[PDB]
């Protein structure tokens, strides 16, 4: 699957996608790939 190596992808038991980016150190509930 095509995914930039900076995008550390994790999924919450709530059924939510949640990002943790290694460069900016950011946590986003918004997935840019899902749209």
């Amino acid at each position: 699957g095509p995914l930039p190596p900076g995008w550390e992808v994790r999924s919450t038991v709530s059924g939510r996608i949640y990002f943790v980016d290694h460069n900016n150190r950011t946590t986003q509930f918004t997935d840019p790939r899902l749209h």
């Binding site: 550390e8 994790r10 999924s11 919450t12 038991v13 939510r16 949640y18 990002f19 943790v20 980016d21 290694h22 150190r25 950011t26 946590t27 986003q28 509930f29 918004t30």
Partner: peptide, 15 residues
Amino acid sequence: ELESPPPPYSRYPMD
């Protein structure tokens, strides 16, 4: 976002 506060950025998240 409009969602609850996301999980604090831990470098390597194992859940």
